Amino acid sequence: ADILPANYVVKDRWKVLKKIGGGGFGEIYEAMDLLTRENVALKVESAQQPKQVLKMEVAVLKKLQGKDHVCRFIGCGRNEKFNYVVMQLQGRNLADLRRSQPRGTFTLSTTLRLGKQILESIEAIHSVGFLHRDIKPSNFAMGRLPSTYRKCYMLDFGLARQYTNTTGDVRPPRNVAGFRGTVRYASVNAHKNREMGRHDDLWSLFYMLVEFAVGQLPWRKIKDKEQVGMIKEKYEHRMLLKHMPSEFHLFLDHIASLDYFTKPDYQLIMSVFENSMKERGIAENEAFDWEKA
Numbered sequence: 001a002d003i004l005p006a007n008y009v010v011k012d013r014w015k016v017l018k019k020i021g022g023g024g025f026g027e028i029y030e031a032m033d034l035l036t037r038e039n040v041a042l043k044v045e046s047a048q049q050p051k052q053v054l055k056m057e058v059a060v061l062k063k064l065q066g067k068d069h070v071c072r073f074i075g076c077g078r079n080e081k082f083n084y085v086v087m088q089l090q091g092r093n094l095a096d097l098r099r100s101q102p103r104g105t106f107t108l109s110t111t112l113r114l115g116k117q118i119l120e121s122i123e124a125i126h127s128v129g130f131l132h133r134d135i136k137p138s139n140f141a142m143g144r145l146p147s148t149y150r151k152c153y154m155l156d157f158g159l160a161r162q163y164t165n166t167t168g169d170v171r172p173p174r175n176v177a178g179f180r181g182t183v184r185y186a187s188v189n190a191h192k193n194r195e196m197g198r199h200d201d202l203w204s205l206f207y208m209l210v211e212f213a214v215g216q217l218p219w220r221k222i223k224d225k226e227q228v229g230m231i232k233e234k235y236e237h238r239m240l241l242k243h244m245p246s247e248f249h250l251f252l253d254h255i256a257s258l259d260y261f262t263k264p265d266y267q268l269i270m271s272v273f274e275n276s277m278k279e280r281g282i283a284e285n286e287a288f289d290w291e292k293a
């Protein structure tokens with residue numbers, strides 16, 4: 001049930017090499033560019049598929065050309081079997097690198113640095129009027145190039161939603177909106193099936209880091225969406241920060257004090273990182289855990 005078989009050629013330029021991603025709403029593929037000879041990420045959506053998501057993916061991707069932490073947009077096109085998008089290919093994702101770590105934990109060096117780069121791409125997308133809503137390790141990756149290999153990127157805009165309007169006002173929230181994502185990094189907003197904000201992409205960020213440092217989350221074992229929520233709804237979030245820098249009592253207070261509407265203070269959270277980095281002699285020119293330096 002693969003949309004393209006190998007050695008298929010889209011638009012006489014992109015020879016499919018293998019599948020690399022699947023899911024409900026599309027398949028992803030490594031392709032050789034036959035024009036420019038580099039390889040590339042070709043994502044594809046069935047033409048008939050009900051939930052025409054890819055197109056909206058390609059709008060976010062296009063508004064974000066210019067920004068860092070975004071794959072270069074190569075091309076898109078549709079025909080009577082599948083719609084396609086072409087973009088730059090990236091390296092190991094964070095989930096996979098995190099598991100590679102002996103203890104399943106990054107140093108605080110690598111965590112705080114990742115922190116800074118993930119937060120930019122979040123602000124970035126907020127800036128062009130979209131929530132990611134599905135923020136997780138496996139949704140970020142590293143470059144594979146001299147020019148990018150120490151660069152962490154953002155993948156998927158599948159679950160993305162616009163929160164503004166044509167001008168720049170905040171769309172009104174739905175009275176309900178059913179969480180459609182990954183439980184482990186879901187806010188309590190999402191568990192309560194309330195319309196997600198920019199703060200909810202920042203809750204996700206918060207929990208991602210805690211797991212990169214500490215190496216686990218309280219609920220990591222559970223897969224019941226409802227349970228997890230009830231635990232997260234009852235848990236003391238300061239208990240996570242017991243082995244984490246004291247600058248993360250601010251990040252937590254800040255996001256616990258936001259709603260849908262209220263814009264987050266991105267600079268504040270960018271400091272919690274840069275301060276904690278400083279009170280620890282951590283430089284950006286430091287190696288990452290996976291590096292063999």
Ligand SMILES: *CCC(=O)Nc1ccccc1-c1cnc2[nH]ccc2c1
Pocket residue numbers: 021028029041042043071087088089090091138139141153155156157158
């Ligand atoms: C530059 C993009 C990259 O390396 N990864 C990628 C490439 C091509 C298509 C998709 C992705 C991607 C998109 N959405 C996703 N949702 C879950 C996982 C992914 C990966």
